[PDB]
Design brief:
Chain lengths: ~290, ~290
Amino acid sequence: MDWGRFVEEKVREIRETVGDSKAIIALSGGVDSSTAAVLAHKAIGDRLHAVFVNTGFLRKGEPEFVVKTFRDEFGMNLHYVDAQDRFFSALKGVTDPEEKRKIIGRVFIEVFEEVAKKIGAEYLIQGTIAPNLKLIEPLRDLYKDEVRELAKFLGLPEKIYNRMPFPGPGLAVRVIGEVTPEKIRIVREANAIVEEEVERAGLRPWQAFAVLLGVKTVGVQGDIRAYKETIAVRIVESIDGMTANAMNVPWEVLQRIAFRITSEIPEVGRVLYDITNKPPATIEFE
Amino acid sequence: MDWGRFVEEKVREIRETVGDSKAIIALSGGVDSSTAAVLAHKAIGDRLHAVFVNTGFLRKGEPEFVVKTFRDEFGMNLHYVDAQDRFFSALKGVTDPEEKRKIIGRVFIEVFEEVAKKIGAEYLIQGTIAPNLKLIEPLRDLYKDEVRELAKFLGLPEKIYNRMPFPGPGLAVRVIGEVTPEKIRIVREANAIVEEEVERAGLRPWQAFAVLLGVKTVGVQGDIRAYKETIAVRIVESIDGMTANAMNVPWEVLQRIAFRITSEIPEVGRVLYDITNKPPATIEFE
């Protein structure tokens, strides 16, 4: 596409809508929010306030990477909000996955509203794609492939424009049952091993992640009465997320994953690989 | 080695020890007790009382097979004992794996003692191998591989002398947490599917089974969403159990297993394959 002309017009559009007001955008690290943020930034520079909320449920290294990218490389106003305590407290004892999602959504809005008020913004930029504050949706006519192309054109890093999707509730829906700091810590480390080994093996799945199942087991070494955690590895191929298949991952890759998780995360005693397609199963476990 | 001589000698030894009294043996379906039973039967005929206890945790078709083999084809003096209510009732509310095993052991002894008292035998036959009632252990000098040879020589079916080992507590240790009739029914059907697919593909693992994890997932049943269960598939290769590797099962076989479980057992919505070796893990989950 004529991206140069697309950018030009869009930046112009945003400039004309915002004028001399402040706008705000929530950054997740996702390709959509990232692409929208760069467009708005090209439009209004220092009057754009990017907000990154550390929920405590993000992937290993994500907070650092988002800051480095948006603050350091792109030179945006980036409000880093450490909300980990707030989110962990809000989820304490919650086992129903629908309630986890509902509460995380609620708490995000609280924290984000709190920041927006201090900024005095007039406009909200959102990364909505095809399918208070006035709404600007610069990516509204674009599909996922087109957004990825634009992100590339705008100079966003490959880590972002090629990224596998990561849910709003983050690692909280990758822990079966009540979320705690320790359970998130374990699943975060397991997730990172999965992503590392998937990348190493040149696998290009739709999604690849770890889930802490809650089931416990004793092993055959050391304290053989100590119950250890169980991780499920979920790796799927899909065009859209609508139908998906469990990936036929080479055996040595699964072995590396199982070995690394049990060796490097001593709290985990068992590793299982999801072999279920969608349908009948969801991609996420919760 | 000389099995004809071994049998002639052992039979004589049993005849000489027991004389005109009765002996009793607990039949598990396992190669050791099966072999010891056939020898004792050769020795003393109907004065051998073979007790087979249906714990309620046996595999699909196993009780029928044990009865057919020992009562119908061998002509043994078999006591078929249905003790299901006793075992399930005893396990009400119990989730701790060690407690489950302890209770099952206790109940078995209770059941066996009750039957033995009515039989009034003077000798207990056991299938102990190398390395009240007077004990006879006709296999005491034999190693595991030798017992299998002997079982074949005595005309025991291949389904016994080449059987994968199966725990005394049976499917009860293949249900995470409280053992209930429904959970046993589900895992029984899943186990059958796993063994059937292993057989279909001509695989010869050390053990191949299913475990009901107790982890719920959101599936569809007809026109509505429904919480469904999660099965773990455990298939291992091993010399003698000392260590074991998660088997590199052909993807097509894993897919048949996942497909059949979720299609034929609609209570199950997700299937996971254990990729953990021993060490660090145990083979069973409980």
